[PDB]
Amino acid sequence: VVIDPSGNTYYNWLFCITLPVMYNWTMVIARACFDELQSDYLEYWLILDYVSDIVYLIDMFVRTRTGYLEQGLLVKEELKLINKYKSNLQFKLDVLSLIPTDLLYFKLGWNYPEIRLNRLLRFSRMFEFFQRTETRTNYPNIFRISNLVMYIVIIIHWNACVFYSISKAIGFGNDTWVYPDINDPEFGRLARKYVYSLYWSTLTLTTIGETPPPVRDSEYVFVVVDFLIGVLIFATIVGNIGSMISNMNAARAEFQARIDAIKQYMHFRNVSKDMEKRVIKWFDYLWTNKKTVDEKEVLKYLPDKLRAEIAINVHLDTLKKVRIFADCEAGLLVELVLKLQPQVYSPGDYICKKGDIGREMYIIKEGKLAVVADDGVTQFVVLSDGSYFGEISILNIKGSKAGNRRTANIKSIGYSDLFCLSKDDLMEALTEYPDAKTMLEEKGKQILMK
Amino acid sequence: VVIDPSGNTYYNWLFCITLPVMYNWTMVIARACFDELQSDYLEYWLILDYVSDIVYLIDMFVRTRTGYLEQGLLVKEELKLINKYKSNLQFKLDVLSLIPTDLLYFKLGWNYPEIRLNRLLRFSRMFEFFQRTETRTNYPNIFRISNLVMYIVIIIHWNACVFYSISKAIGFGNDTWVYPDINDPEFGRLARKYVYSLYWSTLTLTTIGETPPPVRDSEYVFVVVDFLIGVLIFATIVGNIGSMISNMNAARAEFQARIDAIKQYMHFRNVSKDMEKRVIKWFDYLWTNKKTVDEKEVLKYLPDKLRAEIAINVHLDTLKKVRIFADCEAGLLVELVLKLQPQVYSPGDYICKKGDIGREMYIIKEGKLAVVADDGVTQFVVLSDGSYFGEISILNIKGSKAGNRRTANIKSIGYSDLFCLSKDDLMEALTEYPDAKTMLEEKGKQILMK
Amino acid sequence: VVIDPSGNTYYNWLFCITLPVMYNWTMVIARACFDELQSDYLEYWLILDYVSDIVYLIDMFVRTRTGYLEQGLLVKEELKLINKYKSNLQFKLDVLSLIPTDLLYFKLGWNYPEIRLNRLLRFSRMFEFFQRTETRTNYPNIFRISNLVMYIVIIIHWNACVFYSISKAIGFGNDTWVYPDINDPEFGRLARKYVYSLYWSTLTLTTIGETPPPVRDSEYVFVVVDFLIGVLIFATIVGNIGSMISNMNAARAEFQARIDAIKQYMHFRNVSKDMEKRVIKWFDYLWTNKKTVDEKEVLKYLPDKLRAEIAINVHLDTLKKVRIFADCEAGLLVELVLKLQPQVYSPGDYICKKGDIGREMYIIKEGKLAVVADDGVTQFVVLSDGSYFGEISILNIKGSKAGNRRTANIKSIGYSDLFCLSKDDLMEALTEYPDAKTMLEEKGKQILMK
Amino acid sequence: VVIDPSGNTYYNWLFCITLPVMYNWTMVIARACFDELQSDYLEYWLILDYVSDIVYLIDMFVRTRTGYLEQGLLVKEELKLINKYKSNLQFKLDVLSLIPTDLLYFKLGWNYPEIRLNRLLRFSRMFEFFQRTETRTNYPNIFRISNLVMYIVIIIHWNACVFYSISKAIGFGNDTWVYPDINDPEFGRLARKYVYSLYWSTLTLTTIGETPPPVRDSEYVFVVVDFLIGVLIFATIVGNIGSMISNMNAARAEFQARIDAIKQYMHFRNVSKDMEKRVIKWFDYLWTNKKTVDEKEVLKYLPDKLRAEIAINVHLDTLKKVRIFADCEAGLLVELVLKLQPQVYSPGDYICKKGDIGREMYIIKEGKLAVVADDGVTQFVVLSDGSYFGEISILNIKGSKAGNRRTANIKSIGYSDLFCLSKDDLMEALTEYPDAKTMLEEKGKQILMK
Ligand SMILES: Nc1nc2c(ncn2[C@@H]2O[C@@H]3COP(=O)(O)O[C@H]3[C@H]2O)c(=O)[nH]1
Ligand SMILES: Nc1nc2c(ncn2[C@@H]2O[C@@H]3COP(=O)(O)O[C@H]3[C@H]2O)c(=O)[nH]1
Ligand SMILES: Nc1nc2c(ncn2[C@@H]2O[C@@H]3COP(=O)(O)O[C@H]3[C@H]2O)c(=O)[nH]1
Ligand SMILES: Nc1nc2c(ncn2[C@@H]2O[C@@H]3COP(=O)(O)O[C@H]3[C@H]2O)c(=O)[nH]1
Ligand code: NA
Ligand code: NA
Ligand code: NA
């Protein structure tokens, strides 16, 4: 065997089947409308159509060999897959899109390729590929815009073909509206035919209108309907363009809107230009160093038993340098990684101060912190990455003259990325295995006596 | 009896009255402006107008026979309904729209059907039908787009009629702007008249402008006002189109935006392509198997005493296979169905692990789980649908060497849809009837000894 | 005083000063550009300009006599108000807009009314009136759309005047682009002048372009700049139109989106058409009876000491029929009115059932409820409006064989609007005055014995 | 060293390098396409190009001398900065944009300035400056709109240059579509050349289309592609304009939407016009006095150890007049400034009333309050700014006949801005230093006895 739709093989086949479906959606109508296209390159159209039909057949086979999830397990029983396929509307659409209507080439002649129009009924495969690509691609907005542009181009191409067909029905050159006479040297070339039809279609759907006005009632009606199709469908698609660009700007726009609200508040309250500059510097840091997004709000949509792995694969850089995690229990790190709230501190920010509520443990992910003196400048100890502080005031200790108080003040030399671990959480998670707690308050007593 | 507006009969009548109202809103102005329309098909217009008026009268009768809610009860007293009708502005509008202005046909002649313009004053019924359909239809966006297209078409039709009337007032063919001379063979046909007027209207309201420029001051003024009506009203309607397409994409766009934020985080943090593929697979599963929507956020707008029924009608498939619910008390299932949080687990995800906080009971809705050994591969027990686990570590038990600990580790073979029932909730809800609890810890002791 | 800007007198004056400001913003540029406008109606323009200037002077006086809030109190000291006025930029703008530039009529002649262009510098007053109207009017969206239309019209009018002025500078009729020769009988009329200039302006700003193309470099540059002004500013304004219509649809669109999510869930889960019809009926009820909006989310932006008054003025209809409120303490009703959560129940919905957690007291605002038998049909007692139930299981009672249990089952005959009062809240709020509690458990014992 | 990108020097250099990048992005294509531009002002183009290249070199030097943050510290080691530069793609782009392609002037002649097209590869610097300006400027929306207008102008300019180049390739005047013959006196001027090309570009990108239709297939194709570029890219940019105006209106629109929901509720519930006027007055006050924004929601994105400084720099005006803060401990004010919830009370609003739950302490930021008698009018004490009340009922006091009760009723004479400090918070924060608490209940006893 089976294909496992989640796999890469299924996605690759989705591409390989979208190619004929897109080809069919573009060219069947073109060949049906522009007769010279069908006739001049008939030897190539036959090859391409037969290849497309072969790929359609192989796609039907793949649909027979693609497993589905019952009880969460991939069904691998062949006949079960055949039944699941045939019971779905997709099998009906596939049989309809693979009906050998090409036999009508013997009746209607080689000049009627619209018999292959049923081949469009595999559009679903194409759309599936798109909805898969949009999910799996690393450039979701580039692909989304390319998809919208493809839809625009297909719509304009189809409307060009429709215009040319209507000109044919009315008669080429019978009036100033229809496509001019084919017998003209310049206006008889297939290139000119298609490109002028596309020009007309673009002017009509984009509602520019710089085309000869209608002459007949059918022409007036078609032009009204087509200008309305233009207005509505092009507003739809080119406003989807707008929404895609909006969601492209979503993060940056939200960040900038927050900054603007802050600046409005500061200018209204006449906040000192010192503090205004400090705030602007904080936000410039958040942007430049790519910290505007908070991983919590993003990863909250992941499963906890997958977001856990995510956090591990991101923070194993530092949670191996820490003494508590991955050293004593070697598994405890998972119990708290999904609750280590990542904070960022500016240069000179006092994370801790003597005589404060010690309700948070900190793990230094990045940055240089200092166990300073209360004078403000004298740096007693420099804590680099992997260090952990703020854990002594969490625990119950014998001989602690300072209970629930910070034993020292910790300031940040530079921008520090820390993991604030709350006291309640450390309490709750160390209950399972105190084999790490013993050396934890080993460190605790050792630092509390000195 | 009375009609009970909530019923299907009332909605069917809403359709049956919207038909004449829509007919009146489309055709009265057309016949008033295009005199040949009124004259040539007068025998049909008379029949249709009289049928419309009869339906208007029957709608007034229905309004006299439609109950309203006082004290939440449907008023069935006839005279009370007559008073409620006559006291509402709707009765005034109905009498105004049913005034026999057709008598003016004897004074103004058969060429003045705008006397029936008062018939438009039942627009409310039409709009009511729409606002009912949008609520009750299964295709809300299809109907909404059809409604907007109907508004566009009606506006363009009315503007075409207005253009033709203005041409008539100025005189057909008196200058290049107005509709050409009626005496022309081609430009005198009612078909050509209406269709060219519609063409002009479309070019003006869509602001394409490929029409002969005005000549007189009245023409310049009307064209300015009409181009502005075009800009404003068509932006309104065709931007409502945009918002409707947006809300069509709302679920998919939110899902894809979450996926994009996740992928941005993973690529920025250089998350391993293993875990990136796992996350993409999780999201592909959520989409393909239609799990992107969380029933909680959707059904939270339902009444609890209706959302309860909803959850029951959805989850009675599994809550009959469970041993606790619908078996001992047979009513307890409602006390917890509105708090069974549905979770989804990937293949191989450890739902439970030995030596963890047993604070959640799980009911396997769909999927195969395994009571494995801690080695990781040896599957002791396979739990299929209807099974419940994680309930032993909830309860107070005699002789439990493992208190508040998982007696075994449960992993998911495939994608498991479970119902996580919190410990606090099971505690709170079993307090009412311990007739099920006794066999609950029957199972508890039986599994805790073996 | 003083005038007290919050008062109605200040708003009326805002209108009376917006009239000259709007007049000045519309007509000064018109008279400056269309010389015939200035000249032909000079006797009227002089009167209107002098009246506008008098009103400007009276507006300056009002600004001297309008109090401001210092320490939250309206300043009534005259000289303090004069200082507050003169210290503001508004005084500078007012003196600038009232500078007697009309004296230049003696130097530049009566054909130069753009000397009155400084009169536009009172635009602020106009805008203030708008921002006041939008706040105080009952039709905020009608006024907002009228304001946007006024901006569109003013922009188009100004661009028409600019086009005519540029034609004058280049010379009327010197090329096909500029306004045609004034000496023409038809193209020399002030009506034709202004209306064709407005036509050109509309075609340019709405970017229709059906105007003679530029000839000179200045004309090309102006047309480029004006088409870009068109694109940008008209997108701005006519997209503000879109956002205004969106916020017009905001409530209805949110309601309908909730209904659509519900219907999607129900159709996906194959919810029985019984329950689907019940849900659709619930939502039809919510809409038809105007219950889609929840007063909590709306009134949460009001002050509690004003939202309290709001809730009182709305619910004094029923909280006078209740026995506890406004009867014993006569003031207790305010302590709980801001926490009476309004619920709606469908016909037949069991609000209470025997043997359930009695943690909510209910006050029947509207609707008929029944104290039924557990059989389901036998109605023991019918509770109409003003009745209160679910209070016995809240209180501590002697001789209650049923503790924390519902003494009877309450069902809703029809759609009941109730006030669910939580047990914790009744406990917390009755602590202040048990003078009502005594008769509360009077009723309690009386019903618990029978 | 180093430059410290957060500093003002780096931003100034960002401007000084954006000037050549913008110059290059505007003029290289212009000179490449309009040959007369390159030739006539070659002496000036050479100077400007060499100055631009010198500034590019100095920008490369700056990039070598700009520190980056490792461990949150600004790297000042020269060679480390050289490595960080050369290891980034920016160094590749800078070397590519500074390659001396001007040497090709000796081969291709002075008429080929597109060899300087590589100079566009420093676009990043320009964009960086923009993203810095948008952050640091006080007019974020003005700058954003200016940036979008710059993008529009650059796109139109580039498309004008492209049109002129295509006309050159096809041949000037070979058909009606291309730019006319250069040999024409009027259509040969560089001014006319560029300005008509810009006119064509504006008509095409804004999709007005009032230009001669294409003649050749290449012209038709280019016009289709360019009209589509117009539609898509101009919708993008001029809808970004819409979103920028939306976020300009965001605060005012949210405020007005809240007011509209309130007014809809009041008119639907038939709220008395007294209370409707009171609510409208409250909202008029909120707007006029600039209180629609709540500093909590804005400043919650700031760091707590920066939002603290913000609140201090804003509220030190009053927290120096208070007796508790900045007087006894002199540091306690920071422990509670981030939890002082700012409330606003209308004139006559009873903040406190005798016999109520004293769970909030109030600090009068602005406004006159009264310790009144319960009669309602007799004002015992007038509390101005700096005063604090509601603190007696917070504390545990000996001899308090009124426990957890308000000792008096406080009403607001005028609009009072207060700081509501919750009881729990005062309890929690005074635990650290009771040196202020002693005089706190000094005041407490002193007022409780009298
Ligand atoms: N007092 C003290 N604290 C230190 C030293 N080195 C690291 N620290 C950390 O500084 C922290 C300050 O807050 P805590 O008292 O909670 O915990 C303290 C220790 O974790 C040291 O040498 N002396
Ligand atoms: N230990 C054990 N647990 C089982 C077995 N079969 C099912 N389970 C479930 O596995 C669950 C693991 O978590 P709990 O200990 O809370 O509850 C356990 C039982 O509900 C079994 O055979 N042995
Ligand atoms: N048992 C009983 N309850 C009644 C009667 N009339 C009204 N009620 C209300 O029905 C309510 C059901 O819930 P509670 O027991 O909390 O409170 C009960 C009473 O408030 C009655 O006649 N008998
Ligand atoms: N009773 C009384 N209260 C006063 C007086 N002056 C100020 N107050 C304040 O009024 C407040 C009312 O609420 P509290 O009793 O909590 O605290 C009271 C005091 O803080 C006074 O003279 N008498
Ligand atoms: Na156009
Ligand atoms: Na157009
Ligand atoms: Na046009």
SS3 per residue for D4-41: CCCCHHHHHHHHHHHHHHHHHHHHHHHHHHCHHHHHHC
Q: At what angle do helices B235-268 and C235-268 cross, to 10 degrees?
A: 70
Rounded CA gap, A168 and A37, in Å? 14
Question: Which tokens belong to D316?
Answer: 């030190």
User: Which amino acid makes up residue B291?
Assistant: K
**Integer-rounded Cα radius of gyration of chain D:** 34
Give the separation between CA C354 and CA C193, rounded to whole angstroms.
84
Ligand 1 centroid distance, CA of A408 (Å): 5
Contact A210 D213 (CB under 8 A): yes
Taking an 8 Å cut-off on Cβ atoms, the answer to whether A224 and B202 are in contact is: yes
Query: Nearest-CA distance from C158 to chain D in Å?
Result: 21
B343 contacts B390 by C-beta, under 8 angstroms: no
Q: How far is A302 from chain D (nearest CA, A)?
A: 24
CA distance linking residue B175 with residue B166, whole number of Å: 12
Burial B373-401 (b: 16+ CB within 10 A, else e): eeeeeeeeeebebebbbbbbbbbeeeebe
User: What are the helix (H) ranges across A174-317?
Assistant: 190-205, 217-229, 235-268, 273-288, 295-299, 304-315
Q: Which residues contact C173 (CB under 8 A, 6 or more apart)?
A: C179, C180, C181, C182, C183, C184
Measured CA to CA, the distance from residue B374 to residue D2 in angstroms comes to 57
Q: Distance, CA C358 to ligand 3 centroid (Å)?
A: 11
Cβ of A407 closer than 6 Å to ligand 1, yes or no, is yes
Tokens of B108: 């103004």
Q: Tokens in use for D259?
A: 């007011």
**Element housing B380 (H / E):** strand B379-383
Strand partners, D419: D342, D363
Q: Which amino acid appears at position B176 of this protein?
A: T
- Do residues D252 and D316 touch, judged by C-beta distance below 8 A? no
Bridge partners, residue B383, by sequence: B369
**CB of residue A373 inside a 6 A radius of ligand 1:** no
DSSP letter, residue C270 = T
Phi and psi, residue A176, nearest 5°: -70, -15
Tokens 């209608």 appear where? A214
- Euclidean distance between the first and final Cα of chain D, in Å? 68
Phi and psi of A106, rounded to 5°?
-75, -25
Is the beta carbon of A363 within 6 A of some atom in ligand 1? no
Q: Which residue type does B22 have? A: M
- Spatial distance between the Cα atoms of B121 and B96, rounded to a whole number of angstroms: 7
The DSSP code for A393 is G
User: In this complex, how many residue pairs, one in chain C and one in chain D, have their CB atoms less than 8 Å apart?
Assistant: 165
Q: Say what the alpha-carbon torsion angle A389, A390, A395, A401 is, to the nearest 10 degrees.
A: 110
Amino acid present at D237? I
8 A C-beta contact, residue B13 and residue B20: no
* Residue list, ligand 4 pocket, CB within 6 Å: D 352, 358, 371, 380-381, 389-393, 406-408, 410, 447
Between the CA of A389 and the centroid of ligand 1 the distance, in Å, is 6
Beta bridge mates, D352: D410
Q: With beta carbons under 8 A apart, name residues in chain A contacting D309.
A: 275, 278
Whose CA is closest to atom 16 on ligand 3?
A: C390
Decide if C138 and D267 are in contact by the 8 Å CB cutoff: yes
As a whole number of angstroms, the distance between CA B115 and CA B100 comes to 9
Residue C336 near residue C426, CB atoms below 8 Å: yes
Alpha-carbon gap, residue D260 to D252, rounded angstroms: 12
Contact call for residues B306 and C279 (beta carbons, < 8 A):
yes
Closest ligand to the CA of A213: 7
Separation CA B207–CA B189 (nearest Å): 26
Question: Residue C190: exposed, middle, or buried by beta-carbon count in 10 A (0-12, 13-18, 19+)?
Answer: middle
Residue C344's Cβ-side half-sphere holds a number of Cα atoms within 13 Å equal to: 19
D89, burial (CB in 10 Å: exposed 0-12, middle 13-18, buried 19+): exposed
Residues 6+ apart with CB under 8 A from A133: A11, A143
3-state secondary structure of A388: strand
Experimental method: cryo-EM
- What spacing in Å lies between the alpha carbon of C389 and ligand 3's midpoint? 6
Answer whether B102's CB lies under 8 Å from B31's CB: no
Cα distance between residue D61 and residue D16, in whole Å: 13
Burial environment of residue B119 by CB neighbours within 10 A (0 to 12, 13 to 18, 19 or more): buried
- Dig out the tokens for B119 from the structure: 């018939």
Nearest to C429 by CA among D357, A134, D201, A115: D357
Helices (H), B206-360: 217-229, 235-268, 273-288, 295-299, 304-315, 333-337
Cβ-defined contact of D217 to A368 (cutoff 8 Å):
no
Work out which ligand 2 atom sits closest to the CA atom of B409: 12
Chain C residue numbers with beta carbons less than 8 Å from the beta carbon of D272 are 313
B242: nearest CB among A132, A235, A290: A235
Which residues face B122 on adjacent strands? Answer: none
Distance from CA of B378 to the nearest CA of A (A): 19
Q: For residue B420, give every residue at least 6 positions away whose Cβ sits within 8 Å of its Cβ, in sequence order, or none.
A: B340, B341, B342, B343, B360, B361, B362
The residue of chain B nearest to residue C201, with distances taken between CA atoms, is B224
Are A246 and D247 inside 8 Å of each other by CB? no
Please give the distance of CA A317 from its chain centroid, rounded to a whole number. 27
Ligand 3-lining residues (CB < 6 angstroms) = C 352, 358, 371, 380-381, 389-393, 406-408, 410, 447
Size of interface B-C (CB pairs under 8 A): 164
Closest C-chain CA to D355: C432
Q: How far apart are CA D84 and CA D76, in angstroms?
A: 12
Helix (H, G, I), strand (E, B) or coil at D109: coil
Ligand 2 interacting residues, C-beta cut-off 6 A: B 352, 358, 371, 380-381, 389-393, 406-408, 410, 447
| Strand blocks (E) in A388-442 | 388-389, 409-422
Q: Is B407 annotated as a binding residue?
A: yes
Interface touch C242/B232, C-beta < 8 Å: no
Q: What is the resolution of this structure in A?
A: 3.6
Asked if the Cβ–Cβ distance from B242 to A232 is below 8 Å, we say no
Q: From the CB of residue A39, how many other CB atoms can be counted at a distance below 10 Å?
A: 14
Q: C366 pairs with which residues across the strands?
A: C417
Task: Enter the tokens of residue C315.
Answer: 């619910």
- Whose structure tokens read 């009626």? B182
Q: Which atom belonging to ligand 3 lies closest to the Cα atom of C388?
A: 20
Q: What's phi and psi for A249, nearest 5 deg? A: -85, -5
CA–CA separation, D291 vs D365, rounded Å? 14
| Chain C contact set for B235 (CB, 8 A) | 238-239, 241-242
Alpha helix positions (H), C206-234? 217-229
Burial (Cβ within 10 Å: 0-12, 13-18, ≥19) of residue D345: buried
Across the interface, do B195 and A208 touch by the CB < 8 Å criterion?
A: no
Instruction: State which ligand 3 atom lies nearest to the alpha carbon of C402.
Output: 15
Instruction: Give one word for B74, left, alpha or beta, with left for phi > 0 and alpha for psi -120 to 50.
Output: beta
State the Cα–Cα distance between residues D280 and D272, nearest whole angstrom. Answer: 12
Pick from D379, D27, C355, B283: nearest CA to A132? B283
Residue in A84, A303, A316 with CA at minimum distance from that of residue B412: A303
Provide the shortest C-alpha distance from residue C433 to chain D (in Å). 10
Residue D420 C-beta-side C-alpha neighbours within 13 Å: 12
Instruction: Choose the closest CB to B299 out of C249, C265, C415.
Output: C265
Torsion angles phi and psi, residue A418, rounded to 5: -115, 165
Tokens in use for A22?
């897109």
Scanning D75-139, the segments in alpha helix (DSSP H) are 78-86, 89-97, 105-108, 123-136
Which of D241, D272, D346 comes nearest C236 by C-beta? D241
Kindly state the tokens that stand for A25. Answer: 């959606």
Cβ–Cβ gap C224/D413 under 8 Å: no
Q: How many CB atoms lie within 10 A of CB B261?
A: 18
- Fill in the DSSP letter of residue A230: I
Q: Which residue of chain A comes nearest to D334, CA vs CA? A: A356
The answer to whether the CB of D254 falls within 8 A of the CB of D298 is no
The runs of H, that is alpha helices, within B65-139 are 78-86, 89-97, 105-108, 123-136
Q: What is the maximal distance between C-alpha atoms in chain D?
A: 106
- Residue to mutate among C2, C3, C73, C135, with most D CBs inside 10 A, is C135
C-alpha–C-alpha distance, residues D422 and D263, integer Å: 31
For residues B226 and D236, give the distance between their C-alpha atoms in angstroms, rounded to a whole number. Answer: 27
Three-state secondary structure call for residue B153: helix
The tokens of C371 are what? 């104290």
Q: How far apart are CA D438 and CA D449, in angstroms?
A: 16
Instruction: Indicate the annotated binding residues of C.
Output: 390, 393, 406-407
Tokens of C120: 């536009």
The region, left, alpha or beta by phi > 0 then psi within -120 to 50, assigned to residue D390 is left
- By residue count, chain B amounts to 450
H/E segment holding residue D350:
strand D350-352
What is the separation of C-alpha C330 from the centre of its chain, rounded to a whole number of angstroms? 35
DSSP reduced 3-state for D189: coil
Q: Which residues of D are annotated as a binding site?
A: 390, 393, 406-407
Could you tell me if D69 and A366 are in contact, meaning their C-beta atoms sit under 8 angstroms apart?
Answer: no
